[PDB]
Amino acid sequence: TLQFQKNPETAAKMSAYMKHQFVFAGIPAPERQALSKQLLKESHTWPKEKLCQEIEAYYQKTEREYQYVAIDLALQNVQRFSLEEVVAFKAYVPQKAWWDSVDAWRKFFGSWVALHLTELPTIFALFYGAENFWNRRVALNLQLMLKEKTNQDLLKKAIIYDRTTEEFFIQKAIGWSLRQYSKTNPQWVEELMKELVLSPLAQREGSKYLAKA
Amino acid sequence: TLQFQKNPETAAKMSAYMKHQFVFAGIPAPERQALSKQLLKESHTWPKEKLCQEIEAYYQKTEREYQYVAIDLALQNVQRFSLEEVVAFKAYVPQKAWWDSVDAWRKFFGSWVALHLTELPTIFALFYGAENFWNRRVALNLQLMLKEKTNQDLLKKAIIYDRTTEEFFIQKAIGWSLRQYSKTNPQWVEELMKELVLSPLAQREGSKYLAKASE
Ligand SMILES: [Cl-]
């Protein structure tokens, strides 16, 4: 495997930023991309089994950027995965979980769905009602980039399921999903917030792009 | 396996345009692209061996649009090929060759090289000085889309090699290589064209974007 040298100073600041949930090598995203560029390039040519093994191998390394590399390996190869391989990735979402890895997994699941729109409800269903809130954050935010292809019923159903959930990262996810969708359909978003009793946090977060909050 | 519906009237026209040497189904490119979209999408998911076998099976089908399908399969999966796999695709360039398939193959090799720029000399050398002029057409046009990433020496070497070659498809390829590169480096193109005595066709084609003294 690729090996990051430690930038101890930057590493401590990134850790503090991530509320000390993880140790870092201390490597900003653009720099990580430059260091892992040859690896990501080579990854497109690997047999599927080799690719899955390498994603597992990087994910299990201790420093945080190695989870980012593993998730980039999946994202850069998102077109190569079948439905059944994508379903197997769900196993990683709860692993080493914080908003940073989970949102990266969500971008992976979201990108694959945007490639395979007919499986939107299948992937949504994988995460909907999950025991683990990080899994439900994926269901809530699966459609962030779908714009006019957002499935409103599914979005609404996820928000309703988590309406009064106390978890900070869940209320944030509801808010994010609404503000994103409001760039496409401000009326449906504004009306939903009037018809449901949302947390103050979701409501504030959900109304960022509206003319009147 | 994608199957095109035969459109006899459109096929006659497409066939005539390639001088009646291929059988056509009669599926123009925009329609072909819409009809093969889902096959191209699922092709990314195929094991490498299946992908090579499918490319080969489409290439060996009768109608010309299936060769276009084959090259699209390769083009869409360009990132998936190692150097060794790309070298093996050179075997297709002289097969069922005419400007339509060879220029589509050239696009494949140019895209792969755009993705793996350190291998430009290696891919160029596959085609440079080949016996089959269709292969040398690829050498001449490998860099059409490379702009500032173009390797001048290799371009110049290829033009020198075929400078006096009679073949229309070669002189045309020389002119195009100069035309495209002049959008990036008109001085270098100017210098070369004054250094070498190029065919009237190559000279007309390559000097399109150079300023004239009479204004
Ligand atoms: Cl990133």
**Of B67, B96, B116, which one is at a domain's C-terminal end?**
B116
Closest C-alpha among B180, B182, B89, B74 to residue B135: B89
Residues B89 and B19 in one domain: yes
Residue B39, chain A, CB below 8 Å: the answer is no
The token pair that represents B69 in the structure block: 């399908």
The SS3 call for residue B63 is strand
Tell me, what CATH number does A187's domain have? 1.25.40.290
Resolution in A, one decimal? 2.1
> Which residues lie across from B101 on neighbouring strands?
none
Residues A199 and A170 in one domain: yes
Within 105-134 of A, beta carbons closer than 8 Å to B belong to 115
DSSP run (H or E) holding A31? helix A29-35
Quick check: B77 and B86 in contact, CB under 8 A? no
The token pair that represents B173 in the structure block: 């390829």
Question: What DSSP assignment string belongs to A107-174?
Answer: HHHHHHHHHSGGGHHHHHHHHTT-SSHHHHHHHHHTTTT-GGG--HHHHHHHHHHTTT---HHHHHHH
Quick check: A185 and A167 in contact, CB under 8 A? no
Residues A122 and A213 in one domain: yes
Amino acid at B185: N
Residues B39 and B1 in one domain: yes
> Which residues lie across from B23 on neighbouring strands?
B63
Helix axis angle, B168-181 to B186-195, nearest 10°: 140
Amino acid at A166: E
Nearest-by-Cβ selection for B44 from A41, A47, A79:
A79
CB atoms within 10 A of CB B76: 18
**Of B116, B143, B172, which one is at a domain's C-terminal end?**
B116
The rounded distance, in Å, linking the Cα atoms of B141 and B137 is: 6
Amino acid at A183: K
The token pair that represents B82 in the structure block: 């190692």
| Burial grade of A93 (CB within 10 A; 0-12, 13-18, 19 or more) | buried
The rounded distance, in Å, linking the Cα atoms of A44 and A39 is: 9
The token pair that represents A161 in the structure block: 């399921």
The rounded distance, in Å, linking the Cα atoms of A70 and A57 is: 8
The rounded distance, in Å, linking the Cα atoms of A78 and A113 is: 10
Tell me, what CATH number does A78's domain have? 1.20.1660.10
Give ∠ CA A123-A41-B52 in degrees, rounded to 5: 80
Contact B45 A80 (CB under 8 A): yes
The rounded distance, in Å, linking the Cα atoms of B38 and B15 is: 26
Distance of CA A162 to the CA centre of its chain: 17
Residues B132 and B212 in one domain: yes
Dihedral (Cα; B199, B202, B203, B207), 10-degree rounding: -170
Give ∠ CA B71-B72-B76 in degrees, rounded to 5: 120
Residues A105 and A143 in one domain: no
Q: First and final CA of chain A: distance in angstroms?
A: 49
Residues B147 and B105 in one domain: no
Dihedral (Cα; B20, B25, B31, B36), 10-degree rounding: -120
> Which residues lie across from B63 on neighbouring strands?
B23
Task: Give, in order, the Cα–Cα distances in Å from B142 to each of A150, B91, B101, B174.
Answer: 42, 16, 14, 11
Which residues, 6+ apart, have CB-to-CB distance to A126 below 8 Å? A87, A90, A139
Which residues, 6+ apart, have CB-to-CB distance to B45 below 8 Å? A79, A80, A81, A82
Q: How many CB pairs under 8 A join A and B?
A: 22
Residues B125 and B68 in one domain: no
Contact A82 B45 (CB under 8 A): yes
DSSP at B147: G
Instruction: State the smallest CA–CA distance between residue A109 and chain B in angstroms.
Output: 16
Q: Please tell me the total count of domains within chain A.
A: 2
Task: Give, in order, the Cα–Cα distances in Å from A192 to each of A139, A204, A205, B81.
Answer: 18, 14, 14, 48
The SS3 call for residue A181 is helix
Quick check: A142 and A155 in contact, CB under 8 A? no
DSSP alpha helix (H) spans, B21-165: 29-43, 48-59, 64-76, 83-89, 99-115, 120-127, 133-141, 152-162
Radius of gyration of the CA atoms of chain B, in A: 18
Instruction: State the smallest CA–CA distance between residue A80 and chain B in angstroms.
Output: 4
Residue A24 CA, ligand 1 centroid: distance in Å:
14
> At residue B23, what are phi and psi to the nearest 5 degrees?
-90, 130
DSSP at A6: P
The SS3 call for residue B1 is coil
The rounded distance, in Å, linking the Cα atoms of A174 and A172 is: 6
Residues A201 and A136 in one domain: yes
Residue A68 CA, ligand 1 centroid: distance in Å:
7
Quick check: B148 and B114 in contact, CB under 8 A? no
Residues A83 and A73 in one domain: yes
Residues B71 and B41 in one domain: yes
Residue B48, chain A, CB below 8 Å: the answer is yes
Amino acid at B50: K
Residues A163 and A128 in one domain: yes
Chain A residue closest to B38 (CA)? A116
Handedness of CA A198, A204, A207, A213 (dihedral sign): positive
**Of A116, A142, A173, which one is at a domain's C-terminal end?**
A116
**Residue A11 is part of which domain span?**
1-116
Contact A45 B80 (CB under 8 A): yes
The token pair that represents A213 in the structure block: 């909050």
Task: Give, in order, the Cα–Cα distances in Å from B147 to each of A96, B150, B186.
Answer: 44, 6, 11
